[PDB]
Each structure stands twice: as structure tokens, then as C-alpha cells.
Design a protein around this ligand. Sequence first.
Ligand SMILES: [Cl-]
Ligand SMILES: [Cl-]
Length: 261
Amino acid sequence: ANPYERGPNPTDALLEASSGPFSVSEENVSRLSASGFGGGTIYYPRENNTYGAVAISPGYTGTEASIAWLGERIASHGFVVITIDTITTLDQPDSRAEQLNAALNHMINRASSTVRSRIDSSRLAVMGHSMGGGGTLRLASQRPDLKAAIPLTPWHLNKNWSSVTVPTLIIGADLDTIAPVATHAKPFYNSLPSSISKAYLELDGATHFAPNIPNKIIGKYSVAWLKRFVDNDTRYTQFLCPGPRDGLFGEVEEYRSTCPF
Ligand SMILES: [Cl-]
Ligand SMILES: [Cl-]
């Protein structure tokens, strides 16, 4: 049996809820004590166990407030999650990649024993919004030991991510005029190797700012992806394969994947 399984057997309704089954506490990280990034908040499950750890970046002009809901929701499904502030809010994707890496290292090495005792440092993931999603792709290309990557409405001038080996879920937004899916999210997904576990989920009726507002579909599929790949939790394959409905009258605009994985 899988030693990394946490929490009850999942259902659609459990993943769509505003909170998962774990109570969550928070640890503040000050800007100055955050070596290589701008501080942030660590959310963790109160139940003592070891969990995978996730670092999440905002985008250009964004602060951790724009991603806080998602950090707390993911932590409530059984993850230690840091939502970061960047060194400046105008940092570019490849800078955000370095800061995500710094934040992972902070959680493992420099956070309190309350946080560190709950982290399985061999099971790490990264996520980010917009330029933070571009930073997610860059770090995933640089760190094949990561267990999952989730770029949310990502922006990056580099379209070629054929070097990425990490299981990657790209979430695009159909109405996005800031990082249009035709020039960012879809080219990124298409350049990822066909031989990795990957998926593309395009939200219906959503703008670039959809990740900054509590969103049932972003929360559901982020958690399912992290469960399946950070925890190797095959109880969550059912949500990814075949995935959300995308036909006429569907849950999303489009879903693609390399299932069965
Ligand atoms: Cl949506
Ligand atoms: Cl929603």
C-alpha cells in the first residue's frame, strides 16, 4: 500500500468544497529572513504526519494575497504550502523560478520545527500564476526531482519546454487577454514531451484573474494533480482520466492529457 496516501477516499464534492478535510495552521515568513525571496505564509495541516510541500508564486504586480486562498485550500487537503511574495512585484518569470526554489529550501531548512517536521523533503511541487506560472515551467525544467508543476494562466516569452520531465498541469483561461492561451498556455503544453504525464485544462468563461478568486475547478484539479503526482495517490486518477467534461455544455472549455500516465 502507498505510504503517502493522506485523507479520506476522494469524491467530486469533497474536491469542490471551499475547505478540505484537514484543519490548517499558518506560519509567517518575514521578508528579510526569507533568503532569496520576499517572505510569505506557510500553510500546513494540523494533524502530525509528513506531507509533500508546495511553493506558489504570484504574478507581475501580484502579492501573496492574490494566491492565499489557493495555498490554504491546497494545504487543507494534506500539503505544506508556502505562498510567497517576490523580491519585487515586478520580477520576471526566470527570477520567479529562483525565488520558488529559494522558498522550497526555506520550508525544508529554515522554517520552524513545527513546519519542517511535517515536510517530506523528497516530495516537492511548484505552482504559480501568470509570470509565476512561467517561473514554474522554468524551475520544472531546472529541477527534474520535483514531483509536480502547475502553471496557472502562465506567461513566458520562451515557448519551448521540451526539457521538462516533471508531471505538469497547465491551466489556461479561455478569455485571457494578458497571457492568451494561443500564445502562452497552449504552445507551452504542446512543447512538453509527449512521454511525460501532463495535462492542459482551459477554463470556460474565465479571465487572466480567475486564479486570484476562489475557483472550484482550479481548486479541484490542482489538488487532484498534486495528490496523484506528489503523493502517487492513484485514488485521484479518476478525476484526471478522462478528466473534466469539455464538450458543448461542459465543465471546462478544453481538456487534454497524456493519460493513462
Ligand atoms: Cl471556472
Ligand atoms: Cl468557481
